[PDB]
Coordinates of C-alpha atoms in Angstrom, one line a residue:
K1 CA -74.7 -24.5 0.7
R2 CA -74.6 -22.1 -2.1
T3 CA -72.1 -19.3 -2.3
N4 CA -73.8 -17.5 -5.2
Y5 CA -76.8 -15.5 -4.1
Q6 CA -78.7 -14.9 -7.3
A7 CA -81.1 -12.4 -5.4
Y8 CA -78.2 -10.2 -4.5
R9 CA -77.1 -9.8 -8.1
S10 CA -80.6 -8.4 -8.7
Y11 CA -80.4 -6.0 -6.0
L12 CA -76.8 -5.0 -6.4
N13 CA -77.2 -4.1 -10.1
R14 CA -80.7 -2.8 -9.5
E15 CA -80.0 0.8 -9.6
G16 CA -81.7 3.8 -11.2
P17 CA -78.8 6.4 -11.8
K18 CA -80.5 9.7 -12.2
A19 CA -77.8 11.5 -10.9
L20 CA -75.2 9.8 -13.2
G21 CA -72.6 12.3 -14.1
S22 CA -73.4 15.0 -11.4
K23 CA -71.6 13.5 -8.0
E24 CA -68.9 11.5 -10.0
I25 CA -65.1 12.2 -10.1
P26 CA -64.1 14.9 -7.8
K27 CA -60.8 17.0 -7.8
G28 CA -59.4 15.8 -4.6
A29 CA -55.9 15.1 -4.0
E30 CA -54.4 12.2 -6.3
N31 CA -53.0 10.6 -3.1
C32 CA -56.4 10.8 -1.2
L33 CA -57.2 6.9 -1.6
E34 CA -53.5 6.1 -2.2
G35 CA -52.7 3.2 0.0
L36 CA -56.3 2.5 1.1
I37 CA -58.3 -0.4 -0.3
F38 CA -61.7 0.3 -1.2
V39 CA -64.4 -2.2 -1.3
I40 CA -67.7 -1.5 -2.8
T41 CA -70.7 -3.7 -2.2
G42 CA -74.4 -2.9 -2.5
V43 CA -76.4 -0.5 -4.7
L44 CA -75.6 3.2 -4.2
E45 CA -77.4 6.2 -5.2
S46 CA -76.3 6.6 -8.9
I47 CA -72.9 5.2 -9.9
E48 CA -71.8 2.8 -12.4
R49 CA -69.5 0.4 -10.7
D50 CA -66.7 1.1 -13.1
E51 CA -66.7 4.7 -12.6
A52 CA -66.4 3.9 -8.7
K53 CA -63.7 1.5 -9.4
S54 CA -61.7 3.8 -12.0
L55 CA -62.0 6.8 -9.4
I56 CA -60.7 4.5 -6.6
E57 CA -57.9 3.1 -8.9
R58 CA -57.2 6.6 -10.2
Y59 CA -56.6 8.2 -6.8
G60 CA -54.2 5.6 -5.7
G61 CA -56.5 3.1 -4.1
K62 CA -57.1 -0.6 -4.8
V63 CA -60.8 -1.5 -5.6
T64 CA -61.8 -5.0 -4.6
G65 CA -64.9 -6.8 -4.2
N66 CA -63.9 -8.7 -1.0
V67 CA -63.3 -6.9 2.3
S68 CA -59.6 -7.3 3.1
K69 CA -57.5 -6.4 6.4
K70 CA -56.5 -3.2 5.0
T71 CA -59.9 -1.9 3.6
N72 CA -60.6 0.5 6.5
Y73 CA -63.7 1.8 4.6
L74 CA -66.4 -0.5 3.4
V75 CA -68.5 1.2 0.8
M76 CA -72.0 -0.1 1.4
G77 CA -75.0 0.5 -0.5
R78 CA -78.3 -1.1 -0.3
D79 CA -77.2 -4.8 0.5
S80 CA -77.7 -6.8 3.7
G81 CA -75.1 -9.4 3.4
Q82 CA -73.9 -10.5 6.7
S83 CA -71.0 -12.3 5.1
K84 CA -69.1 -9.2 3.9
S85 CA -70.2 -7.0 6.8
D86 CA -69.1 -9.4 9.3
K87 CA -65.4 -9.2 8.1
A88 CA -65.3 -5.6 8.1
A89 CA -67.1 -5.3 11.5
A90 CA -64.5 -7.8 13.1
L91 CA -61.9 -5.5 11.7
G92 CA -63.2 -2.3 12.7
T93 CA -63.7 -1.4 9.1
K94 CA -66.1 1.5 9.0
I95 CA -69.0 1.5 6.8
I96 CA -69.7 4.4 4.3
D97 CA -72.0 5.4 1.7
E98 CA -71.7 6.6 -1.8
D99 CA -71.8 10.0 -0.4
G100 CA -69.2 9.0 2.1
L101 CA -66.7 7.7 -0.6
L102 CA -66.9 11.1 -2.4
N103 CA -66.8 13.0 1.0
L104 CA -63.3 12.1 1.9
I105 CA -62.1 13.2 -1.4
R106 CA -64.1 16.3 -1.5
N107 CA -62.2 17.0 1.9
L108 CA -59.1 16.7 0.0
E109 CA -60.1 19.5 -2.4

């Protein structure tokens, strides 16, 4: 019984942002993420977690690391944690990619 998976920290923070400052921060509606809880897990394409978090928070969303019952959208990059995914799955919380996160906001442009 170990709840900290050291291997996961390696994967989740092993990103090679070559498109950092390219896909980031759209001009969507300020209300787009407002009232929606976003949970970011796994390694995305290229995003510093804070830029995601600040973005989510800025657009009225709450960013948290644990999938809640009001999440709706689980941003999942490369990680295979059954633990976080199962909760989302049981709720019907849909899994999205980095592109998916921005895709919603891009729609509100």
